[PDB]
């Protein structure tokens, strides 16, 4: 393929015109999707693809200056779905993909038919209006333990993150695409998400969005889905599983995959 789809270990599997789009979230890859991926390809072309940074992809080709804000992320999206020649996808984006995908669809609405957000937050730092479910002190604690032992960070990251019970497979597995990132990567997009904040743009949202998370998040209260639904410009709908987990896709499979594949089959 083109030097960007390999850049980003672009996989597409199926042909014709139907078409999602699934991006992760911040310490994973593609294979987050795993077990969301054998229920689409019978009726679905899907595109796979990895964030710039991830540890699957090339630490050289991480520009600090492009990556400095979500935009570089969104605009690597647009890449793709050009390059792919894609006219029209439903764009499935877990953490801070939602977000990318997003962003990406306020620059080009046409690309998207619809937008499923998994575990998304437009915001996680508190102020005195509105709950993220971080003050800025609890995030500077964790910019802090990245420094010093990334190796000590990970491991006491990925079962919160993940949650469920601490020597899970899942949880193994998040550790170990975490630590694959390069320290001062993780360490740069760390504070790109965690200090972000879209929920000025919100209003200007015309592609219609499915919201979705876990009952239990760690780095989503549920009040933020409600944010999402009451400020998004577009037409959306709301669901909290009854599930645990920031990556409840990998983590909770059996009580997760149903919901989302309602929400990529069925239109509002």
Known sequence: MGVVEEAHNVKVIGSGEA??????????????????VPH???????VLYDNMGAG???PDYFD?????????????????????????????????????GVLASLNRPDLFSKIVMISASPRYVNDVDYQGGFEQEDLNQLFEAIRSNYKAWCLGFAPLAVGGDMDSIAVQEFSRTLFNMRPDIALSVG???????????????????????????????????????????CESVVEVIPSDG???????????????????????
């Open 64 to 100: 600090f200056d492009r990556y400095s804000n979500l935009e570089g992320y969104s605009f690597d999206l647009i890449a793709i779905l050009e390059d792919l020649k894609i006219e029209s996808c439903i764009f499935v984006g877990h953490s801070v993909s939602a977000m990318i």
């Open 246 to 268: 920031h990556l409840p896709q990998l983590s909770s499979p059996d009580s997760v995959i149903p919901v989302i594949l309602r929400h990529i089959r069925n239109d509002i």
């Open 19 to 36: 078409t999602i789009v699934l991006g992760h979230g911040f310490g994973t890859d593609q294979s987050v999707w795993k077990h969301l």
């Open 191 to 233: 504070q790109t998400i965690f200090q972000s904040d879209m929920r000025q743009i919100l209003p200007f949202v015309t592609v219609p969005c499915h919201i979705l998370q876990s009952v239990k998040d760690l780095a989503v209260p549920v009040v933020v889905s409600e944010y999402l639904h009451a400020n998004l410009g």
């Open 40 to 46: 689409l390809v019978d009726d679905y072309r899907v």
């Open 56 to 58: 699957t992809t090339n």
